[PDB]
Symmetry: C2
Subunit: 202 residues, 2 copies
């Protein structure tokens, strides 16, 4: 059973799939597609969208998975990272929802020239971004554990760190001296998962 | 127990919470907040965002739930509408993800001056809207049952009907003589759930 994570963007939507697998201690192969080869690769991907995950058993049979956060939730559920109670499940989804709202602001900046980019970044960093970071800070405070939901790793944790890194991609100093719970979350996450600590260092 | 669904909106994000409860045969109270009353209501809502769900027990204890699709997933999970196996769960999340991509196109048209709204409606209906509808059609085909995932109601079913109604909101004729599996899905869904059939007329 061989897992291939097929994607173009190293900083993209595959991050949540890769981090789930890393934290789960699961081997996989990264297959990165270049812009140049995409037109030729597209018709070979069911649904024609990346990221996608190709799973090949030892009899050469192929199962395809599409929709990156659906894949990540499947892999997370399989390896006990989607909450241990229905209440924890709710809170996992709550924080994923909140991080996706933040991610969607980051998305407004993508594929622009110098400006719109500069103009968008400025609008989002003064608008919804700080509101959303505050909401996430309070969700983290309300955890019954040291992590986003309880004390052990969930998808909510990995989705969060990926989205924060996009925020800092826009303004590296944006969270400096602020959102201590968010910095504290990352410290704590890296402690609970040497694997992810290792992966993120590399 | 007493469930209150607090929202704007209407044809908004509350639809998936309400449809889930309706399909689960769970009673609840709708509390609709006017634009005029929102400034005074906001500080009483944790996180200051709607939709939100206020749950009051017999002892007058108050539990708040936020993030509408996290709420919808909680309620769906509690009532066996999130798939019966891990593969069914992945497929529920797959279709939810696909419908939300469609929903995001619909969102580009909201709160616009009619000028650019007309321009946006025209832009998406020729762009990603039919691409996404085709993807959803193929997802429905791949179901092992008559509904989006298997033969029984899941959150994916309700998210799909809500989003398709938004598309027809933009162009009431867009799916006429097209996407037969989508028409077929809705045919089937109302059959499988007399409760929802009722709600969707009433």
């Amino acid at each position: 059973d061989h897992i291939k994570v097929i994607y173009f963007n190293g900083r993209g939507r595959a991050e949540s799939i890769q981090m789930t697998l890393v934290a789960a201690g699961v081997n996989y192969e990264d297959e990165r597609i270049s812009f140049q080869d995409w037109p030729k690769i597209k018709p070979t991907i069911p649904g024609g969208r990346l990221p996608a995950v190709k799973i090949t058993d030892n009899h050469g049979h192929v199962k395809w998975m599409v929709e990156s956060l659906a894949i990540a939730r499947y892999m997370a559920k399989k390896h006990h990272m989607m909450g241990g109670t229905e209440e924890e499940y709710y809170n996992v989804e709550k924080l994923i929802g909140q991080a996706e709202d933040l991610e969607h602001e980051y998305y407004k900046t993508l594929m622009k020239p110098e400006e719109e980019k500069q103009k968008i970044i400025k609008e989002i960093l003064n608008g919804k971004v700080p509101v959303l970071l505050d909401i996430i800070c309070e969700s983290l405070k309300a955890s019954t554990g040291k992590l986003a939901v309880g004390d052990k790793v969930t998808l909510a944790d990995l989705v969060l760190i990926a989205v924060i890194d996009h925020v800092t991609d826009l303004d590296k100093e944006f969270l400096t001296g602020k959102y201590p719970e968010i910095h504290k979350h990352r410290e704590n996450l890296l402690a609970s998962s040497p694997r992810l600590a290792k992966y993120l260092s590399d």
